[PDB]
Each structure stands twice: as C-alpha cells, then as structure tokens.
C-alpha cells in the first residue's frame, strides 16, 4: 500500500485501490510530482523523448523484420496488382481446422498487410527480403543508440541545464536547417542514388553505390550550373516500374500528375521536391541569432510587433517569456501543427498517391485515410487540452500585461464571451440548417417525390476544381482555359502531366462533387465548429467563470465544485476535453464515412448511388452501412467462416466496448460505492474466504477516473468497430 | 530447429509466461511498504 506512487506521497498514503488507479494516470504528469524542480523536469522529459524515439524505431524494425520473414514481399514485387501483401504469420492455439484453412496464405496462416508498407518500401527501392532485414538491423541499432543517449543524458556530467533547454534560437536553427533541410537532402540523395535506378532496373546497393553514377554526366552539371541536364530524358509513358523498359536518365524533373503504370507520383518529381525543400529549409535555418553576431533575437521580433493604430493591445511583448517558461504552450502548438500535418497527409495521400500500385490497394487506402484522420482528431484535441492546461497552471497575467494594457494573448480572455458566443452561434446555425436540409430530403424522398429535394450545387468548391484545370463544370476559369496567364505560364513545365491527371475519371485527384458533397461538407464544418467551441470554451473558462470564479485554484482536472449553486457537474477544463472527445469522434466518423462511401462508389463504379442517396440520411443508413455491412457480418455464420471472421469478431468487440463505455458514462459513482460496500460485507462475513483479505480497501472509481474509463471504452470501441467495418466492407465488396 | 518452429516457441512463451512474471513483479511492487 506504499512505495508504488514513488512520485506522490499523497497517493502512497491512500488506503484504498484508488492509489493504484491514480498511480498509473499521474505517472507522466512530472510537474505534479513530489520534490520536483524544473531542471529535473526537462531532463526527465528529454530522456523520455529518447526512449520514445527508440520505441518508434523498434516498432518500424519489427514491421520490417516481419515482412521480411513471414511476408510475401518478393512475390508481390513480380505481381503487385494480384498478389495481396502479407503482414505477419499467425500462430493461435484456439484456431480450428476451418480457421487455419481460411487464414492460410502460402505456408502458414497470415494477416494481409493494410499498412501499405509493401508499396512504400517498393517505391523507395527495396526488392529483396534481405533489404528489409538490413533495414530492421539498422533500425534496431538506431534504437540502441537512442536508448544509450537517453541513459547518458541522465548522468551527472551530461545532464543539460535549463538555459540549454530554453535556448530557442539554437534549437530552431538546428531543427529547421539540420533536421528538416539536411534530412530532405539525404532523402533526395537516397531517392536519386537508390530509388531512381531501382525503378529503372539498375540495382544500387551498399556495394555498388560508390561506382554507379546516379546520372550519366555525374555531378558535372551541378557544379557547371547546367542544372537542366538532370531533367533531360525523363521516364517515358511506357516505362514499366522496376524495369529498364521505357526508362530514362533524368533524376530531377517537373512532370506533374502520375506515373502511367503505377498511377503514382514520379520518383524524379519527389526527388526534385525534396531537394527544393532541403534548400529552402537549410536557408531558413540561418534566421535566428547564435554565437556569431548575426541572426534574429525572437524576443525583439515579438516585442516590436504591435500595430501602431492599436488593435491587438500592446502586441506580443510578453509572449516570449510566456512560451519559453511553459511546456504546455509549446506542446499545444506542436500538437496543433502535427494534427494539421497529418490531416494534410490523409487528404493528399489519397488524391495524390505517392507510392507505386497503392492506388489499386483499396483496403489499404481506406485504412490509411481513416488512421490518419483519427490521429489528426486526437492530436487536435490534445493541442486544445494542453492549451487549457497552460491556462490553468502556466499562464501568468502579470507577464502578459504592461501598465494595465494586455498583450495579444491576455486579450483573448477579455472577449472570451464574444468568442464563445460566436462559436455557439456558428455551431447552432450549421447544425440547425444542415439537419433541416437533411431531414427535408429524408421526408421528401420518403413520400416518394424526390424532385422536391433541396440540392445545392457546391459551386464554390467546383470553382476551385476548375481553377486547377478540371474541365468538368464548364467554368473556363484559370487552368480550364488555355489562354489564361496561369496556363500559358506553366504550359511547358507541369500542366500536361497535371491536366492529364486531374481530368481523369479513374483518379481520386479532385473527385467530382455534387449536392451530397455540399451537405456532408457542411456537416463536417458543423462538427469542426462544435468541437472547437467545446475546446475553446474549456480553455478560456479554465481559469474561472461565473459559476466558479476560482477554478484555477482547483487545477486542470477536478471532479466538480459540489451540488451547490445549482449544481457543478463537469465544470473543470478536463471535462471540456472529455466532452469534446465525443464530438471529435463524431466529426472524424462523419469525415471517414463520407470518404469511404465516396471511394466505395468510385471503385465499384456506381458513383450514381452516392450522388443520389447521399443527400438524405436514410440514403446513408441504407446504402453505406446496411449495404456494405453484409460481407462483414457474414465472416462466420452457422454454416462456415471466411478470412473476414476476425473482422466480424472485432465488430462485435467494438460494439461491446462501446456499450461498456455507456455503462461508465451513464451510471455515476455513489451507486457503485454502496454496492462495493455490500460486496465488502459479504467477503468479510463468509467462512473459508475470511482467511484472504485485501491490503487496499476496495472503493468505487473516482468521478474523473470513471469519466476517463468511459471515454476510453467509448473511443476504443468506436475505433475498433469502424476499422473492422471499413476493412471488411472494402475487402468483401471489391473482391 | 527450423525457422517455422519459432512461432510455436515464442508465442506461448511471450503471451503466457511474460504476463505471469510481469503480474508477479507488478503486484509485489505495488503492494510494497516502507
């Protein structure tokens, strides 16, 4: 009953099971630990970062090793459009003979790989199960390096100080230039040297790379300035990927669009992209000042940025010390940027597939988009939660105020009511009218008169599609016109490739849109606005409100303030995160439902099914869920089973976890404490069991813990059931 | 010993033995005193 929460003496003195539960959930909140200083905080965070990167590299190495050992990578190379990639083998003693037979792939039961790693590794120039093994070996070596570094930087003479940790200019210069630019430069080097010849049949391994010229002229044009030579003779339109037939000699080109065979971006396009990004980031990494008297001091930049007329208060004067001294502000900024970035990855890796033969891998396309959108929602909610935490525990009004006037951040708490009221107005506006149009379509179609539907053509979005060259909406605007200056400017660089790809019905590049797209985009906007409303309200109201003008004195996460003053359930800022998690899950569900139904109709060919039935709710319920759930639920029946049996089991498992979350959310404490007391009496008053007694007094889960557990069940069930549905439906419908 | 015997050697090992020893260690640690 002691010594487990070593970091908290208050918990270690708890005589109940709450100590164990809270010991887990407070282990990473280093700022709240006993005998805590800032130096130890930054050092522990640094070591934890090292361990985390080691974990990531070990996970990647495991994926590589299991593809190399139990996969069919080599067979998939020779026939990427017919051979289904294998993730890893299965050894489960609970299998019957039927399950073994159904999951049997080649030599052993195995799982199909939906991560798209086969296409990614094939694109970057891997052709052998020994190339994957080398990658796994190297990644385990890198993990060992990172673990050694993490141990080393906790040693006495190697523990960095607060000044080093808060040295913003040095870290920015190095991160930008070194990390981004130099990693892009090295990736361009690999892309060219290995990937470009490997796509043309020439093997460039760790033996013949110092003697195989990536370009026939060989670094002469680069130093000579004749950089056009690297773009001459690109890959033809009859080039077979991985073979020298119809190949070229160029290494950096503009082509635009996709490879005619793999239906993916040109490797020479991506090498040029990464070279340009490398140059730009290396240049941008010299901005801030270091030991050589030139550069920028960001404190001065922030302080000097006050509009002269005066509408942002005193400007950004106090922001430097605010961000530097707070790890939650930086964490929130990083999480918001990462969420936007992974939303970008999801939205671009389906419209512009970058890996060979990934466009025809429909289950992996759906899985990748869903995975990245869910990660995006999680990251955004985390960014807002950490902003709220910064408000609660790191924000100092004195730093952000100069002689009564407030800086740009402190002024966000002055018109907080205006911000929240207008977020509420936008949410109500969008919800009222999107639901009104959807229900109008529902009722009108149900009454057998679909012509009375309200169908709004998304002209604004179709205008953008025409601006990028789509000649489908008869707009003749910028790139849909051959005479506009936008078209004449790039008529010789990348329009022929771009136009040939955007004006193609088999791509996902700028999918044609209609009224259903309009309505679902408005639903998405409503979801985004409502999630933002909850999170922003929790962040701004974190320090106090009218119901609790001292909420900052109770911390970020506390159960309530009691039944007084009318009742104060879910009044903390943590509860705002807890409520906004449901709205994030709902919004990501809407986004992924829209994407998956649109792409299922596109792949099956019945795009008229979406364009007609997507305007009313029953259309969704009947033609997406009810229609495509048939292959999934018949993964096992009283007659047999298929390789989709695991997905049906996961479907039911997700439903069960969802409803257990419903348990933990609807039923609150107090009802579970008295029942536990009855159980305690029963155990204490029964023979043959009195010999065994608990060391920690069994008590009901706390209010905040119960909310967390219900949210965890809700989210896990949500994710599992939707993953099972999307994967099984795609597999069982599209062969 | 072939490579295909490794799943049958490791999956029971990990998925049953590692839980047992991990539970023993974690229970002992969280039930300690001072």
């Amino acid at each position: 009953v002691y010594k487990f929460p070593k970091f908290s003496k208050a918990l270690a003195e708890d005589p109940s099971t709450r100590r164990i539960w809270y010991g887990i959930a407070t282990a990473h909140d280093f700022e709240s630990h006993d005998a805590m200083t800032e130096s130890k905080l930054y050092q522990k965070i640094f070591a934890s970062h090292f361990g985390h990167i080691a974990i990531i590299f070990l996970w990647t190495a495991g994926n590589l090793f299991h593809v190399a050992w139990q996969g069919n990578f080599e067979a998939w190379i020779l026939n990427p459009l017919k051979v289904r990639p294998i993730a890893h083998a299965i050894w489960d003693p609970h299998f019957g003979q039927a399950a073994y037979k159904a999951f049997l792939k080649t030599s052993s039961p195995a799982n199909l790989a939906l991560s798209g790693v086969y296409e990614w590794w094939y694109t970057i120039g891997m052709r052998t199960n020994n190339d994957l093994y080398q990658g796994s070996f190297f990644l385990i070596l890198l993990s060992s390096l990172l673990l050694f570094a993490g141990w080393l930087h906790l040693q006495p003479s190697f523990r960095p100080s607060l000044d080093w940790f808060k040295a913003n200019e040095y870290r920015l210069n190095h991160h930008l230039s070194g990390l981004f630019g130099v990693s892009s430069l090295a990736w361009t080097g690999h892309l060219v040297h290995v990937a470009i010849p490997e796509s043309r049949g020439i093997h460039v391994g760790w033996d013949n790379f110092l003697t195989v010229l990536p370009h026939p002229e060989g670094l002469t044009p680069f130093f000579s300035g004749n950089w056009k030579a690297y773009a001459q003779n690109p890959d033809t339109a009859s080039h077979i990927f991985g073979s020298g037939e119809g190949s070229g000699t160029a290494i950096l080109t503009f082509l635009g669009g996709f490879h005619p065979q793999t239906k993916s971006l040109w490797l020479t396009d991506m090498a040029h992209h990464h070279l340009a990004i490398a140059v730009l980031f290396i240049v941008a990494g010299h901005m801030y000042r270091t030991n050589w008297l030139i550069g920028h001091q960001m404190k001065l930049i922030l302080e000097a940025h006050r509009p002269p007329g005066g509408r942002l208060g005193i400007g950004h004067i106090g922001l430097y010390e605010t961000i530097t001294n707070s790890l939650h502000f930086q964490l929130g900024l990083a999480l918001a940027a990462l969420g936007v970035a992974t939303s970008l990855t999801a939205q671009h890796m389906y419209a512009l597939p970058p890996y060979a033969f990934l466009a025809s891998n429909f289950p992996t396309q759906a899985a990748l988009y869903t995975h990245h959108q869910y990660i995006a929602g999680f990251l955004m909610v985390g960014a807002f939660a950490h902003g709220a935490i910064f408000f609660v525990r790191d924000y100092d009004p004195a730093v952000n105020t100069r002689n009564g006037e407030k800086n740009v951040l402190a002024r966000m708490l002055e018109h907080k009511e205006a911000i929240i009221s207008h977020l509420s107005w936008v949410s109500l506006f969008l919800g009222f009218h999107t639901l009104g149009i959807y229900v109008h379509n529902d009722v009108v179609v149900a009454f057998g008169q679909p012509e009375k539907q309200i169908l709004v053509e998304p002209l604004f979005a179709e205008w953008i599609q025409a601006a990028s060259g789509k000649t489908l909406y008869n707009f003749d605007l910028l790139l849909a016109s051959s005479n506009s200056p936008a078209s004449v400017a790039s008529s010789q660089l990348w329009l022929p490739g771009w136009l040939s790809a955007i004006n193609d019905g088999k791509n996902s590049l700028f999918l044609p849109i209609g009224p259903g797209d309009f309505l679902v985009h408005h639903a998405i906007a409503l979801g985004l606005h409502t999630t933002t409303l909850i999170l922003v309200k929790g962040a701004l109201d974190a320090r106090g409100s009218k119901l609790m003008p001292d909420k900052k004195d109770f911390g970020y996460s506390f159960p309530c303030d009691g039944p007084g003053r009318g009742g104060t359930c879910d009044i903390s800022a943590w509860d705002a995160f807890y409520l906004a998690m449901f709205w994030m899950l709902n919004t990501i569900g809407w986004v992924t439902f829209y994407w998956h139904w649109k792409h299922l109709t596109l792949w099956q060919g019945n795009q008229v099914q979406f364009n007609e039935s997507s305007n009313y709710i029953m259309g969704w319920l009947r033609d997406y869920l009810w229609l495509n759930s048939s292959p999934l639920i018949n993964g096992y029946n009283p007659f047999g089973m298929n390789s989709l049996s695991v997905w049906a089991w996961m479907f039911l498992f997700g439903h069960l976890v969802w409803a257990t979350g419903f348990m933990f959310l609807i039923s609150w404490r107090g009802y579970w404490q008295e029942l536990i007391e009855t159980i305690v009496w029963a155990h204490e008053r029964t023979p043959l069991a009195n010999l065994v007694r608990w060391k920690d007094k069994p008590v009901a889960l706390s209010i905040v813990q119960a909310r967390l557990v219900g949210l965890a069940h809700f989210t896990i069930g949500y994710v599992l059931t939707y993953a099972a549905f999307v994967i099984a439906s795609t597999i069982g419908k599209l062969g | 010993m072939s490579l295909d015997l490794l799943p049958s050697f490791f999956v029971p090992l990990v998925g049953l033995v590692l839980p047992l020893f991990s539970i023993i260690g974690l229970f002992l640690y969280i039930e300690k005193e001072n």
Binding site: L58, A68, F137, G150 | L3
Partner: peptide, 30 residues
Amino acid sequence: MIYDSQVYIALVIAVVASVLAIRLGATLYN
C-alpha cells in the same frame, strides 16, 4: 527466405537493445 543465422543475430541484437532499455528504464528511476 532469411536464414537461421540472420534471425538469430537479429534476436541477439534485440536482446542488447533490451538491456539498454532497462538501463534507461531504471535510470528514469522506480
């Protein structure tokens, strides 16, 4: 198909990475 030697040495290297992990874990304290 990878050999027994390839898998064996990868397992041995994985063990070394495990001993480095507990050293980091124990250094991050109880």
